[PDB]
Design a protein around this ligand. Structure first.
Ligand SMILES: [Xe]
Ligand SMILES: [Xe]
Ligand SMILES: [Zn+2]
Length: 257
């Protein structure tokens, strides 16, 4: 169906997914001058100690690293969240050039890429149920800039060659997502949506202020993936990011300063 091309990209999504023009769409630009510190925000708690990765796959839009979410072995809580959210998967959005790639932007600045760690509200029983709730998901967003290599990302990079085309997957166990986090947990938060169809407005966004650094060698590997399946014409998987959407009547709160 949809994609990131000129004929099926973000500008076309609204036809099959009318909520694309909704009141709480993501991503959005973060204006640091208007996103003010909220002294009522509680400390963010990221507990990934017992994370249990299962596999990594190419869904034709990006690559997902799936986790076993049967227990509270990897959860996100605190911050703006009411309750506990279980980690189910993470994926990235990146560009064809270093100057673009992230979905969220800070004072209009675009980063080379953006990592999204997806979690669902345990009060709803399972992911399917949660996604149809305004407070069903919590996505932790982390910016990536090019510089020093990120050791915690190498395990991922080293297996991308096995899932080059759409539809391929491979077992991916013992991956520790803690290796993808920056030093600081300072963040900005606002009510939003999934950034890809169905674009459901069920997400509480938590975007970290501090980006992590990854090497050019690492980003280059991401850019070698393909949107296409095995056999069809090669279509490099690059620029799989949705542009900033209107903030509308929303507020972006800062956990710091
Ligand atoms: Xe569904
Ligand atoms: Xe990347
Ligand atoms: Zn995403």
């Amino acid at each position: 169906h949809w994609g990131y091309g000129k004929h099926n990209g973000p500008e076309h999504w609204h036809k099959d997914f009318p909520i694309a023009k909704g009141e709480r769409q993501s991503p959005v630009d973060i204006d640091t001058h208007t996103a003010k510190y909220d002294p009522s925000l509680k400390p963010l708690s990221v507990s990934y100690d017992q994370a249990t990765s299962l596999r990594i796959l190419n869904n034709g839009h990006a690559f997902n690293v799936e986790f076993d979410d049967s227990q509270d072995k990897a959860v996100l809580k605190g911050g703006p969240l009411d309750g506990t959210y279980r980690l189910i998967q993470f994926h990235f959005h990146w560009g064809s050039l270093d100057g673009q790639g992230s979905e969220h932007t800070v004072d209009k600045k675009k980063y080379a890429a953006e990592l999204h760690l997806v979690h669902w509200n345990t009060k709803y029983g399972d992911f399917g149920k949660a996604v149809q709730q305004p407070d069903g998901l919590a996505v932790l967003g982390i910016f990536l800039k090019v510089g020093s290599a990120k050791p915690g990302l190498q395990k991922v990079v080293d297996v991308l060659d096995s899932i080059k085309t759409k539809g391929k997957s491979a077992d991916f166990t013992n991956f520790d997502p803690r290796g993808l986090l920056p030093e600081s947990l300072d963040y900005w938060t606002y009510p939003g949506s999934l950034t890809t169809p169905p674009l459901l407005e069920c997400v509480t966004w938590i975007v970290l202020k501090e980006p992590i650094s990854v090497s050019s060698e690492q980003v280059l590997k991401f850019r070698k993936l393909n949107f296409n399946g095995e056999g069809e014409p090669e279509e490099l998987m690059v620029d799989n990011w949705r542009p900033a959407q209107p903030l509308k009547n929303r507020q972006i709160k800062a956990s710091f300063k």
